[PDB]
């Protein structure tokens, strides 16, 4: 396993708190997780895929109940392959 | 207003259905909304920002109740400015 993914999940939960959504926290989270190149970067795309993985992961489990601190590897793998092919990375 | 944003929102709701989340539908939605360049594209980044806007929008309103078919322009504007600066676009 890796604590890399749950870090983003915590970030999702972090912005989930507030009774709404904190866009500034989300942007800060992305900036911190990334770096803030300010241009197209493969790392940024991967970060976006990871952010979406965690965000979609949260949405998927929210409809079931509470969300887990770790996603299902098969699902994660499937999603990763699907988006990897779609954007090339 | 524009029907461009709600189209993505419908896509979010579309994948929200299923009692979980359909990754293949999400990927198809992104591909259809985009084109499938297969490489870094400004349009793809913008699409990702739009997808996140709708996804975060959904999350923000889900905590309040049902989600609207149209997001608040001020919030949309704020988010757009925040992510635009973060990724450069």
Would you report the number of β strands of chain A?
A: 0
> Helix-strand pattern of chain A, N to C?
HHHH
Indicate the proportion of strand residues of chain A. Answer: under 5%
Subunit organisation of the chains: homodimer
The number of domains of chain A is 1
| Shape call of chain A | globular
Major interchain interface with per-chain residue totals: A-B, 41 and 41 residues
Helix tally of chain A equals 4
Nearest-angstrom radius of gyration of chain A? 13 Å
Report helical residue fraction of chain A: 55-70%
Distance between the termini of chain A: 21 Å
| Largest sheet: number of strands, sense, barrel closure of chain A | none
Structural class of chain A: mainly alpha
Protein name (chains A, B): Flagelliform fibroin
Describe what is shown at a glance.
Chains A, B: This is Flagelliform fibroin. Chains A, B: It comes from Araneus ventricosus (Orbweaver spider). The structure is a homodimer of 89-residue chains. Chain A has helices spanning 4-16, 23-33, 42-62, 73-87.
What would you note in describing this structure?
The structure is a homodimer of 89-residue chains. With 89 residues, chain A is mainly α. Chain A has one domain (4-87). In chain A, 67% of the residues lie in helices and 0% in strands. Chain A contains four helices and no strands. Chain A has helices spanning 4-16, 23-33, 42-62, 73-87. In chain A, α1 (4-16) runs antiparallel to α2 and α1 (4-16) crosses α3 (42-62). The longest helix of chain A is centred in the middle third of the chain and has 21 residues, at 42-62. The PDB classes it as structural protein. Keywords: flagelliform spidroin, CTD, structural protein. The assembly is dimeric. The Solution structure of the C-terminal domain from flagelliform spidroin. Chains A, B: Flagelliform fibroin. The organism of A, B is Araneus ventricosus.
